[PDB]
Structures are given as structure tokens and as C-alpha cells.
């Protein structure tokens, strides 16, 4: 009782950008005073906890192009 | 009395060709016979003078794509 399998994907994709100018970008957030206090905190298993976070990000990619792929092949008997 | 100038050209142009085949070209001009006559001849100040010319050209560029640009910025006070 034979079994043949042929997983032949083919991918010739493009993910592209041209851009003449990226320019004159400004990021002036005013100051936010923040105060953080606790008695007790418990984080038992697999926790992701952002708490009392002040963040300024200025992410300015000339490209910033992403591609993801995920080939899975699972055989079971 | 200030003067600013900012000459920021940006050029992302393309000038392009694909071609599958050029293929069979023939250039069989028959015979050419000609006469030019004068007594006396002079030239001055950068004269550019083709005379009595028999020419055969077979110019076959696989891609004959041309680009010219000319940025000029000219200040006087």
C-alpha cells in the first residue's frame, strides 16, 4: 500500500517600493509626567505585562517592506 | 541681505528595453557613383563640411537606449 507525496511550491513574488523623498518629519510630543506605585503584583505563568510605560518611537524606513512565508508539511500514520 | 538657494533634484527614472530576438537583417545596397567639382575652395571659423561622401552603416544595437541630462545653476550679483 504505497504512498507518494510531492510538495513542490514555487514563489517568484515581488514586494517593492520606490520613493523620491521622505522629508521634514517632526516628533514633538509634550512632556507627560507619570507616577507608578504598588503593594503587590504576581505573574505566575507566561505573562507579558507592560505597565506605566512612556514611549517615543520614530521609525522612518526608506523601505520597510516585509514578506513572511510558512511552509509546513506534516505526515502522520 | 541673505540669499539661500537649494537645488535638490531627484531622479529615479528608467529607460529600458527587452527584446526576444533581433534576427536576420540584410543590407544589400547596389553600386553608387558620384561627382563633385570646383575651381577653388576655402573654409574658416569652425566649418564642418562633408563632401562627396559614400557611406554604408548597419547599426544594430541589442538595446540602443539613450539618456541625457543637463543641470545648470547660474548665479550673478
Amino acid at each position: 500500500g504505497s504512498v507518494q507525496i510531492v510538495y513542490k511550491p514555487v514563489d517568484l513574488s515581488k514586494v517593492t517600493s520606490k520613493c523620491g523623498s521622505l522629508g521634514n518629519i517632526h516628533h514633538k510630543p509634550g512632556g507627560g509626567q507619570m507616577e507608578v506605585k504598588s503593594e503587590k503584583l504576581d505573574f505566575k505563568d507566561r505573562v507579558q505585562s507592560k505597565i506605566g510605560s512612556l514611549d517615543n518611537i520614530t521609525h522612518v524606513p526608506g523601505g520597510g517592506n516585509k514578506k513572511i512565508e510558512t511552509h509546513k508539511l506534516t505526515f502522520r500514520e
Side-chain angles (χ1 to χ4, degrees), chain A:
Chain A
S2 70
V3 174
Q4 308 187 10
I5 295 183
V6 178
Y7 179 98
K8 268 201 281 181
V10 176
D11 171 11
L12 274 71
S13 61
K14 310 179 189 182
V15 182
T16 308
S17 70
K18 313 194 203 280
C19 160
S21 30
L22 260 162
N24 207 39
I25 299 165
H26 301 58
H27 196 251
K28 311 186 193 178
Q33 295 190 4
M34 171 157 50
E35 303 184 3
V36 178
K37 307 187 189 182
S38 188
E39 301 177 358
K40 286 191 161 188
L41 320 87
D42 194 304
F43 304 84
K44 283 207 167 189
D45 304 287
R46 306 194 169 198
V47 186
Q48 194 293 287
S49 51
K50 184 175 289 193
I51 320 185
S53 176
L54 195 172
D55 309 316
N56 306 318
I57 302 176
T58 281
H59 171 207
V60 185
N65 294 315
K66 302 198 173 192
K67 179 210 179 205
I68 98 76
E69 296 198 83
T70 302
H71 295 254
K72 174 163 189 169
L73 166 55
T74 304
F75 179 112
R76 313 282 290 261
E77 187 187 351

Coordinates of all heavy atoms in Angstrom, one line a residue, chain A residues 1-63:
Chain A
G1 N 0.8 -1.2 0.0 CA 0.0 0.0 0.0 C 0.9 1.3 0.0 O 1.1 1.9 1.1
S2 N 1.3 1.7 -1.2 CA 2.3 2.8 -1.4 C 1.7 4.1 -1.1 O 0.4 4.3 -1.2 CB 3.0 2.7 -2.7 OG 2.1 3.0 -3.8
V3 N 2.5 5.1 -0.8 CA 2.2 6.5 -0.6 C 3.3 7.4 -1.2 O 4.4 7.3 -0.8 CB 2.0 6.8 0.9 CG1 1.7 8.3 1.1 CG2 0.9 6.0 1.5
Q4 N 3.0 8.2 -2.2 CA 3.9 9.2 -2.7 C 3.4 10.6 -2.4 O 2.1 10.8 -2.4 CB 4.1 9.1 -4.2 CG 4.5 7.7 -4.7 CD 4.8 7.6 -6.2 OE1 5.0 8.6 -6.9 NE2 4.9 6.4 -6.7
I5 N 4.3 11.5 -2.1 CA 3.9 12.9 -1.9 C 4.9 13.8 -2.5 O 6.1 13.5 -2.4 CB 3.8 13.2 -0.4 CG1 2.6 12.3 0.2 CG2 3.7 14.7 -0.1 CD1 2.4 12.5 1.7
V6 N 4.5 14.9 -3.2 CA 5.4 15.8 -3.8 C 5.0 17.3 -3.5 O 4.0 17.8 -4.1 CB 5.5 15.6 -5.3 CG1 6.4 16.7 -5.9 CG2 5.8 14.2 -5.7
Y7 N 5.7 17.9 -2.5 CA 5.4 19.2 -2.1 C 6.3 20.2 -2.9 O 7.5 20.4 -2.5 CB 5.6 19.2 -0.6 CG 5.4 20.6 0.1 CD1 4.2 20.8 0.7 CD2 6.4 21.5 0.2 CE1 3.9 22.0 1.4 CE2 6.2 22.7 0.8 CZ 4.9 23.0 1.4 OH 4.7 24.2 2.0
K8 N 5.8 20.6 -4.0 CA 6.6 21.5 -4.9 C 5.9 22.9 -5.0 O 5.2 23.2 -5.9 CB 6.7 20.8 -6.3 CG 8.0 20.0 -6.5 CD 8.3 19.7 -8.0 CE 7.5 18.7 -8.7 NZ 7.9 18.5 -10.1
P9 N 6.1 23.7 -4.0 CA 5.7 25.1 -4.1 C 6.8 25.9 -5.0 O 7.9 25.5 -5.0 CB 5.6 25.6 -2.7 CG 6.5 24.8 -1.9 CD 6.5 23.4 -2.6
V10 N 6.3 26.9 -5.7 CA 7.2 27.8 -6.4 C 6.7 29.2 -6.2 O 5.5 29.5 -6.3 CB 7.1 27.5 -7.9 CG1 7.9 28.5 -8.7 CG2 7.6 26.1 -8.2
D11 N 7.6 30.1 -5.9 CA 7.3 31.5 -5.5 C 8.3 32.5 -6.2 O 9.5 32.4 -5.9 CB 7.4 31.6 -4.0 CG 7.3 33.0 -3.4 OD1 7.0 34.0 -4.1 OD2 7.6 33.1 -2.2
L12 N 7.7 33.3 -7.0 CA 8.5 34.3 -7.8 C 8.0 35.7 -7.4 O 8.0 36.6 -8.3 CB 8.4 34.0 -9.3 CG 9.4 33.0 -9.8 CD1 9.1 31.6 -9.3 CD2 9.4 33.0 -11.3
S13 N 7.6 36.0 -6.2 CA 6.9 37.2 -5.8 C 7.8 38.3 -5.6 O 9.0 38.2 -5.4 CB 6.1 36.9 -4.6 OG 6.9 36.6 -3.5
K14 N 7.2 39.6 -5.8 CA 8.0 40.8 -5.5 C 7.2 41.6 -4.5 O 6.0 41.6 -4.5 CB 8.3 41.5 -6.8 CG 8.9 40.7 -8.0 CD 9.1 41.5 -9.2 CE 9.5 40.6 -10.4 NZ 9.7 41.4 -11.6
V15 N 7.9 42.4 -3.7 CA 7.3 43.3 -2.7 C 8.2 44.5 -2.6 O 9.3 44.4 -2.1 CB 7.1 42.6 -1.3 CG1 6.4 43.6 -0.4 CG2 6.4 41.3 -1.4
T16 N 7.7 45.6 -3.1 CA 8.6 46.6 -3.7 C 8.2 48.0 -3.3 O 7.0 48.3 -3.1 CB 8.7 46.5 -5.2 OG1 8.9 45.1 -5.5 CG2 9.6 47.4 -5.9
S17 N 9.1 49.0 -3.3 CA 8.7 50.4 -3.2 C 9.8 51.3 -3.7 O 11.0 51.2 -3.2 CB 8.4 50.8 -1.7 OG 9.5 50.8 -0.9
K18 N 9.4 52.3 -4.5 CA 10.3 53.4 -4.8 C 9.8 54.6 -4.1 O 8.6 54.7 -3.8 CB 10.4 53.6 -6.3 CG 10.7 52.3 -7.1 CD 11.1 52.6 -8.6 CE 10.9 51.5 -9.5 NZ 11.9 50.4 -9.4
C19 N 10.7 55.6 -3.7 CA 10.2 56.8 -3.1 C 11.2 57.9 -3.3 O 12.4 57.8 -3.0 CB 10.1 56.6 -1.5 SG 10.2 58.2 -0.6
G20 N 10.7 59.1 -3.8 CA 11.6 60.2 -4.2 C 12.2 60.9 -3.0 O 13.4 60.9 -2.9
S21 N 11.4 61.4 -2.1 CA 11.8 61.9 -0.8 C 11.0 61.6 0.4 O 9.7 61.4 0.2 CB 12.1 63.4 -1.0 OG 11.2 64.0 -1.9
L22 N 11.6 61.3 1.5 CA 10.9 61.2 2.8 C 11.6 62.3 3.6 O 12.8 62.3 3.8 CB 11.3 59.9 3.4 CG 10.3 58.8 3.3 CD1 10.9 57.4 3.5 CD2 9.2 59.1 4.3
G23 N 10.8 63.2 4.2 CA 11.3 64.5 4.5 C 10.5 65.3 5.6 O 9.3 65.1 5.7
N24 N 11.3 66.1 6.3 CA 10.7 67.2 7.1 C 9.7 66.6 8.1 O 8.7 67.2 8.4 CB 10.2 68.2 6.1 CG 10.1 69.6 6.6 OD1 11.0 70.1 7.3 ND2 9.1 70.4 6.2
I25 N 10.1 65.5 8.7 CA 9.3 64.8 9.7 C 9.7 65.3 11.1 O 10.9 65.3 11.3 CB 9.4 63.3 9.5 CG1 8.9 62.8 8.2 CG2 8.7 62.5 10.7 CD1 9.4 61.4 7.8
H26 N 8.7 65.6 11.9 CA 8.9 66.1 13.2 C 8.1 65.3 14.2 O 7.0 64.9 13.9 CB 8.6 67.6 13.3 CG 9.3 68.4 12.4 ND1 9.3 68.2 11.0 CD2 10.1 69.5 12.6 CE1 10.0 69.1 10.4 NE2 10.5 69.9 11.4
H27 N 8.6 65.2 15.5 CA 8.0 64.5 16.5 C 8.3 65.2 17.8 O 9.3 64.9 18.5 CB 8.6 63.0 16.5 CG 7.8 62.1 17.2 ND1 8.2 61.5 18.4 CD2 6.7 61.5 16.9 CE1 7.2 60.6 18.8 NE2 6.3 60.6 17.8
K28 N 7.3 66.1 18.2 CA 7.5 66.9 19.4 C 6.3 66.6 20.3 O 5.3 67.4 20.4 CB 7.6 68.4 19.0 CG 8.6 68.7 17.9 CD 8.7 70.2 17.7 CE 9.4 70.7 16.5 NZ 9.5 72.2 16.4
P29 N 6.3 65.4 20.9 CA 5.3 65.2 22.0 C 5.7 66.0 23.2 O 6.8 65.9 23.6 CB 5.3 63.7 22.2 CG 6.6 63.3 21.8 CD 7.0 64.2 20.6
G30 N 4.7 66.7 23.8 CA 4.9 67.4 25.1 C 5.1 66.4 26.3 O 4.8 65.2 26.1
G31 N 5.8 66.9 27.3 CA 6.2 66.0 28.5 C 5.0 65.6 29.3 O 4.2 66.4 29.7
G32 N 4.9 64.2 29.5 CA 3.8 63.6 30.3 C 4.4 63.0 31.6 O 5.1 62.0 31.5
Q33 N 4.2 63.7 32.7 CA 4.6 63.3 34.0 C 3.8 62.0 34.4 O 2.6 62.1 34.4 CB 4.5 64.4 35.0 CG 5.4 65.5 34.8 CD 5.5 66.5 35.9 OE1 5.0 66.3 37.0 NE2 6.2 67.6 35.7
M34 N 4.5 61.0 34.8 CA 3.8 59.7 35.2 C 4.4 59.2 36.5 O 5.6 59.3 36.8 CB 3.8 58.7 34.1 CG 3.3 57.3 34.4 SD 2.7 56.3 33.0 CE 4.1 56.5 31.9
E35 N 3.5 58.6 37.4 CA 3.8 58.2 38.7 C 3.2 56.8 38.9 O 2.1 56.6 38.6 CB 3.4 59.2 39.7 CG 3.9 60.6 39.5 CD 3.6 61.6 40.6 OE1 2.9 61.3 41.6 OE2 4.0 62.8 40.4
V36 N 4.0 55.9 39.5 CA 3.7 54.4 39.5 C 4.0 53.9 40.9 O 5.1 54.1 41.4 CB 4.4 53.7 38.4 CG1 4.1 52.2 38.4 CG2 4.1 54.2 37.0
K37 N 3.1 53.2 41.5 CA 3.1 52.7 42.8 C 2.4 51.4 43.0 O 1.3 51.2 42.4 CB 2.6 53.7 43.8 CG 3.1 55.1 43.7 CD 2.7 56.1 44.8 CE 3.1 57.5 44.4 NZ 2.8 58.5 45.5
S38 N 2.9 50.4 43.8 CA 2.2 49.2 44.1 C 2.4 48.6 45.5 O 3.5 48.9 46.1 CB 2.5 48.2 43.0 OG 1.7 47.0 43.1
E39 N 1.5 47.9 46.0 CA 1.7 47.0 47.1 C 2.2 45.6 46.6 O 3.4 45.3 46.8 CB 0.4 46.7 47.9 CG -0.2 47.9 48.5 CD -1.5 47.6 49.3 OE1 -2.0 46.4 49.3 OE2 -2.1 48.6 49.8
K40 N 1.4 44.9 45.8 CA 1.7 43.5 45.5 C 1.4 43.3 44.0 O 0.3 43.7 43.5 CB 0.9 42.6 46.4 CG 1.5 42.5 47.8 CD 0.8 41.4 48.6 CE 1.6 41.0 49.8 NZ 1.1 39.8 50.5
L41 N 2.2 42.5 43.3 CA 2.0 42.1 42.0 C 2.5 40.6 41.8 O 3.6 40.4 42.2 CB 2.6 43.0 41.0 CG 2.6 44.5 41.2 CD1 3.8 45.0 42.1 CD2 2.6 45.3 39.9
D42 N 1.7 39.8 41.2 CA 2.1 38.4 41.0 C 1.8 38.0 39.5 O 0.8 38.4 38.9 CB 1.4 37.4 42.0 CG 2.0 36.0 42.0 OD1 2.0 35.3 41.0 OD2 2.3 35.6 43.2
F43 N 2.8 37.3 38.9 CA 2.7 37.0 37.5 C 3.2 35.5 37.3 O 4.4 35.3 37.1 CB 3.6 38.0 36.7 CG 3.3 39.4 36.8 CD1 3.8 40.1 37.9 CD2 2.5 40.1 35.9 CE1 3.5 41.5 38.1 CE2 2.2 41.5 36.1 CZ 2.7 42.1 37.2
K44 N 2.2 34.6 37.3 CA 2.6 33.2 37.6 C 3.2 32.5 36.4 O 4.3 31.9 36.5 CB 1.4 32.4 38.1 CG 1.1 32.7 39.6 CD 0.4 31.5 40.3 CE 0.4 31.7 41.8 NZ -0.1 30.5 42.5
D45 N 2.6 32.6 35.2 CA 3.0 31.8 34.0 C 2.7 32.6 32.7 O 1.6 33.0 32.5 CB 2.2 30.4 34.0 CG 2.3 29.5 35.2 OD1 3.4 28.9 35.4 OD2 1.3 29.4 35.9
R46 N 3.8 32.7 32.0 CA 3.8 33.2 30.6 C 3.3 34.6 30.4 O 2.7 34.9 29.4 CB 3.1 32.2 29.7 CG 3.5 30.7 29.8 CD 2.9 29.9 28.7 NE 3.5 28.6 28.5 CZ 3.4 27.8 27.4 NH1 2.8 28.3 26.3 NH2 3.9 26.6 27.4
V47 N 3.5 35.5 31.4 CA 2.9 36.8 31.4 C 3.7 37.7 30.5 O 4.9 37.7 30.5 CB 2.7 37.4 32.8 CG1 1.9 38.7 32.7 CG2 2.1 36.4 33.7
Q48 N 3.0 38.6 29.7 CA 3.6 39.8 29.1 C 2.8 41.0 29.7 O 1.7 41.2 29.3 CB 3.5 39.7 27.6 CG 4.3 40.7 26.8 CD 3.8 42.1 27.0 OE1 2.8 42.5 26.4 NE2 4.5 42.9 27.8
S49 N 3.5 41.8 30.5 CA 2.8 42.9 31.2 C 3.6 44.2 31.0 O 4.7 44.4 31.7 CB 2.5 42.6 32.6 OG 3.7 42.1 33.3
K50 N 3.2 45.1 30.1 CA 3.7 46.5 30.0 C 2.9 47.3 31.0 O 1.6 47.3 31.0 CB 3.6 47.0 28.6 CG 4.2 48.4 28.5 CD 4.3 49.0 27.1 CE 5.3 48.2 26.2 NZ 5.5 49.0 24.9
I51 N 3.6 48.1 31.8 CA 3.0 48.8 33.0 C 3.7 50.2 33.1 O 4.9 50.2 33.3 CB 3.1 48.0 34.3 CG1 2.9 46.5 34.0 CG2 2.2 48.6 35.3 CD1 2.8 45.6 35.3
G52 N 2.9 51.3 33.1 CA 3.4 52.6 33.3 C 4.4 53.1 32.3 O 5.4 53.8 32.7
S53 N 4.2 52.8 31.1 CA 5.3 52.9 30.0 C 5.1 54.2 29.2 O 4.0 54.4 28.7 CB 5.2 51.7 29.1 OG 6.1 51.8 28.0
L54 N 6.1 55.0 29.2 CA 6.1 56.2 28.3 C 7.1 55.9 27.2 O 8.3 55.6 27.4 CB 6.6 57.4 29.2 CG 6.4 58.8 28.5 CD1 6.7 59.8 29.6 CD2 7.2 59.0 27.3
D55 N 6.6 55.9 25.9 CA 7.4 55.5 24.8 C 7.3 56.5 23.7 O 6.2 57.0 23.4 CB 7.0 54.2 24.2 CG 6.8 53.1 25.3 OD1 7.8 53.0 26.1 OD2 5.8 52.3 25.3
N56 N 8.5 56.9 23.1 CA 8.5 57.7 21.9 C 9.3 57.0 20.8 O 10.5 56.7 21.0 CB 9.1 59.1 22.1 CG 8.4 59.8 23.2 OD1 7.1 59.8 23.3 ND2 9.1 60.5 24.1
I57 N 8.7 56.6 19.7 CA 9.3 55.9 18.6 C 9.1 56.7 17.4 O 8.0 57.2 17.1 CB 8.7 54.5 18.4 CG1 8.9 53.6 19.7 CG2 9.3 53.8 17.2 CD1 8.2 52.3 19.6
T58 N 10.2 56.8 16.5 CA 10.2 57.5 15.3 C 10.8 56.6 14.2 O 12.0 56.7 14.0 CB 10.7 58.9 15.5 OG1 9.7 59.6 16.1 CG2 11.2 59.6 14.2
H59 N 10.0 55.7 13.7 CA 10.5 54.6 12.8 C 10.3 55.0 11.4 O 9.1 55.0 10.9 CB 9.8 53.3 13.2 CG 10.2 52.2 12.3 ND1 9.3 51.1 12.0 CD2 11.2 52.0 11.4 CE1 9.8 50.4 11.1 NE2 11.0 50.9 10.7
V60 N 11.4 55.3 10.6 CA 11.3 56.0 9.4 C 12.1 55.2 8.3 O 13.2 55.5 8.0 CB 11.8 57.5 9.6 CG1 11.6 58.3 8.3 CG2 11.2 58.2 10.8
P61 N 11.6 54.1 7.9 CA 12.3 53.3 6.9 C 12.2 53.8 5.5 O 11.1 54.0 5.0 CB 11.7 51.8 7.1 CG 10.4 52.1 7.6 CD 10.3 53.4 8.3
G62 N 13.4 53.9 4.8 CA 13.4 54.1 3.4 C 12.6 53.0 2.6 O 12.2 53.4 1.5
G63 N 12.5 51.8 3.2 CA 11.7 50.8 2.6 C 10.6 50.3 3.6 O 9.5 50.7 3.5

